Design a protein around this nucleic acid. Structure first.
Ligand SMILES: [Mg+2]
Ligand SMILES: [Mg+2]
Ligand SMILES: [Zn+2]
Lengths: 63, 36, 188, 128
RNA sequence: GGGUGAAAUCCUAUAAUCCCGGGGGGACCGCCAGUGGCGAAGGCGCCCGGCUGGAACGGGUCCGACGGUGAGGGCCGAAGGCCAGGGGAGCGAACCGGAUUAGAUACCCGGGUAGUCCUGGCUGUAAAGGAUGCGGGCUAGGUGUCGGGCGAGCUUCGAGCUCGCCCGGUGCCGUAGGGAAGCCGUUAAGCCCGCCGCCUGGGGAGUACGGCCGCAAGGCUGAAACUUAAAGGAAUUGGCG
C-alpha cells in the first residue's frame, strides 16, 4: 500500500543534540556534508563520513 | 571501396580478397596508359 | 689426462658470522684461479634444523691462505618450488622491492613478499607496501650489515611485517624473498 | 673430512640430452657426455636408452677421480622455447645412482621469462 | 652441436654446444588474473611521486525547462603503407640456398632487407562485430557477481567475516508476448511517444564517364546497354568424412 515510488519520503532526521563541554542545546542534520561545530565554544558535534554522520554528543529527541 | 558482405560467401566463386587485387591492377593500367 | 695430475684440493669456509665451517672441497691448479667462485649451501646445512631447508645462501671467495679459502656473504634466495606453492588462485600476492644502506656503508636491495588470505582491493594493497617500506628502512638504520642479514634469513623482520600489516587485512605468510649486495664501504 | 661432492647438470630437450659432472662450484668440469656420442644414428639420440648409457659412462669416469655424491640440476631449453623436460631426464636420473653414486637434493632450473622476447612461427604456427 | 616424418644446407679444431666469473645492448612487463574493472569507439596490466578527464552512491543544498534528435560542417580512429632524422636485440613480406614432389614459383629446414621501437607530420581504412543507431514510460519470478549506502550478528577489534534490504553496472535459467525458425524475454528482437541514416530479384558493378580531397598508394560520390528464373535464409531424413 502506498508504494515508495509515489510520494517519496526521506530516511534522514533532524536531531536535538546537546553539547558536552558547553551545555548548549542545538539542532543538527544526520547526514551532514560539513563539520558541525558548536555555536558558542567550537567543539565538533558531528562528523562527515560517506553516508551517515557519527555524532559526538548527547541526544534528546529525534524531532 | 564500398563492398558488400554477400560476396565473401565463397559458394560458387573465387575469393574476393583476390578479386579486389585484380580490379586494382586494371584501374591502374587504364590510368597510366593514357588515362589523361 | 695428465693435466688432472697437476691439481690440488682446497677447503672452503663459511663467513665468520655464520661460524667458520667447512662447506665442500674445490680443485685448482694455482690459487690465483680459485678467487671469485660462488658456492650455494642451504640453511639446513649450517646450524642444522629440518625446517629451513628452502633458504639458500651464496658465498663468494676472497682469500687463499694456504689450502684454506675464506668466503664472504653475497646473497640469499628462497627456492622456486616453495614460493610457487604459496601463490594460489584467490589470494592477491603483494610484492615490494627496495634499495637500502646500512651503517657500515653496504648498499643492498631487499625484496619482501606478503600473501593475503583473500582477494583485496588495490588501495588496501599499496597500504601494505607502504608498511613494508616503512619498517624495512627503519630497521636498516640502527643495524650493521652483520645483523641485518642475520635476521633477514631467520624471520625476525617478516614476523614484524606480519604484525603491523594485519591491521589492514588478515594475511598468511609474510617473508623476505631475495637479497643481493651491491657494494662495500669504499673505505677500509 | 675426505668427503667430496659435486653437481650434475642434465640438459634435456626433444632432440638430445647432455650430462655434465662438475665440482661443487661448477668451475672445473670432470666428465661431460651427450646423446650422440653413444648411439650412432640421429633418430633415437633423444631416447631414454641413450640417456641411460650416457649417464652410465659419465658416472664411470667421475667416480674414479674422487667423486662420491652429486646434487642434481635438471634443465629444459626454456627461455623462448619449450618449458618441459623431454623423455630422457628421469631416465638419466634413475641410472646415475644405480652406478654407485649417492644423490643429494634435486631441483629444476629451467629459465622462465617475466614476459620476454618473441618466438618462431609467426601468428599461425607451424602449419605442418 | 643443430634440425627433422627421415635428412640436408648451416655452426665447430683460429676449440663450438655445455658450466663458471664479468662488460655492454635494445624490446616486453609472467604466475595472482576473475562471462572481473575503466573508457564514445579504436583500446588500456611492474612499482613510487607530480598535473588531469568522466561515472556510481549519500544529500528537506543551489539554479529554474536551461531538453531529445540532428541534413551540411568539425574533431578521435588497430594493423599496414609514405616523407624527414635516430636506433636495431628477438621475429621476419621481398630475396639467397637445403629438402618433399609428376611440377612445387607453396607448406617443412638454415640464413635474411624493409618493417616492427623513438621525435615531427600525412593517409582515414577492418569480420572497425553485440553483424542489434540514440533519449522517455510501462509489462511474473529465481539466482551468482563488482561499487556505494543502511540494518543485524560474530570477531585472532582488521580498511575484518556472514546474513537481509535500496540504487547503479555485469552474467545465466525463464513466464506473458513476439518471430520463418535458430532463439530474444525489465541490459527485448515485447506494447507505446520522437528524430535522423539506409533497403527495393540475381549479375553487369563498386565498374565506365565526370567532380572534390592525398606527396604517392589510395579514399568519397556513382550509372546504363545487355544478360538471367532463380540467387538468398532458418531448420528436417539420409549418404558420407
Ligand atoms: Mg553527416
Ligand atoms: Mg623461414
Ligand atoms: Zn558546545
Amino acid at each position: 500500500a502506498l508504494p515508495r515510488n509515489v510520494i517519496p519520503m526521506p530516511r534522514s532526521r533532524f536531531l536535538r543534540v546537546k553539547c558536552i563541554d558547553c551545555g548548549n542545546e542545538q539542532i543538527v542534520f544526520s547526514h551532514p556534508a560539513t563539520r558541525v561545530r558548536c555555536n558558542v565554544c567550537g567543539a565538533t558535534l558531528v562528523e562527515p563520513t560517506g553516508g551517515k554522520g557519527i555524532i559526538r554528543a548527547k541526544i534528546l529527541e529525534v524531532l | 571501396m564500398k563492398r558488400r558482405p554477400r560476396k565473401w560467401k565463397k559458394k560458387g566463386r573465387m575469393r574476393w580478397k583476390w578479386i579486389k587485387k585484380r580490379i586494382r591492377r586494371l584501374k591502374r593500367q587504364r590510368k597510366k596508359e593514357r588515362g589523361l | 689426462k695428465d693435466k688432472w695430475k697437476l691439481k690440488q684440493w682446497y677447503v672452503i669456509y663459511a663467513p665468520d658470522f655464520f661460524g667458520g665451517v667447512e662447506v665442500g672441497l674445490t680443485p685448482a691448479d694455482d690459487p690465483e684461479k680459485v678467487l671469485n667462485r660462488v658456492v650455494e649451501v642451504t640453511l639446513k646445512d649450517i646450524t642444522g634444523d629440518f625446517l629451513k631447508g628452502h633458504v639458500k645462501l651464496y658465498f663468494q671467495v676472497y682469500d687463499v691462505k694456504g689450502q684454506n679459502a675464506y668466503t664472504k656473504f653475497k646473497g640469499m634466495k628462497l627456492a622456486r618450488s616453495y614460493i610457487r606453492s604459496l601463490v594460489r588462485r584467490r589470494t592477491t600476492r603483494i610484492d615490494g622491492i627496495f634499495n637500502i644502506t646500512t651503517k657500515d656503508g653496504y648498499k643492498l636491495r631487499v625484496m619482501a613478499m606478503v600473501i593475503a588470505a583473500r582477494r583485496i582491493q588495490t588501495s588496501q594493497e599499496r597500504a601494505i607496501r607502504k608498511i613494508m617500506q616503512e619498517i624495512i628502512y627503519k630497521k636498516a638504520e640502527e643495524l650493521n650489515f652483520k645483523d641485518f642479514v642475520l635476521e633477514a634469513v631467520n624471520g625476525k623482520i617478516a614476523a614484524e611485517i606480519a604484525k603491523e600489516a594485519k591491521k589492514i587485512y588478515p594475511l598468511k605468510k609474510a617473508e623476505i624473498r631475495k637479497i643481493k649486495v651491491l657494494g662495500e664501504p669504499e673505505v677500509a | 673430512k675426505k668427503e667430496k661432492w659435486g653437481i650434475a647438470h642434465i640438459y634435456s630437450s626433444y632432440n638430445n640430452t647432455i650430462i655434465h659432472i662438475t665440482d661443487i662450484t661448477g668451475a672445473e668440469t670432470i666428465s661431460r657426455w651427450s646423446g650422440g656420442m653413444v648411439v650412432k644414428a640421429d633418430r633415437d639420440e633423444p631416447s631414454p636408452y641413450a640417456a641411460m648409457l650416457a649417464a652410465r659412462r659419465a658416472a664411470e669416469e667421475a667416480l674414479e677421480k674422487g667423486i662420491v655424491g652429486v646434487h642434481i640440476r635438471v634443465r629444459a631449453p626454456g627461455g623462448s622455447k619449450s618449458k618441459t623436460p623431454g623423455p630422457g631426464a628421469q631416465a638419466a636420473i634413475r641410472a646415475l645412482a644405480r652406478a654407485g653414486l649417492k644423490i643429494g637434493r634435486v631441483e629444476d632450473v629451467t629459465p622462465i621469462p617475466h614476459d620476454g622476447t618473441r618466438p618462431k612461427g609467426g601468428r599461425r604456427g607451424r602449419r605442418v
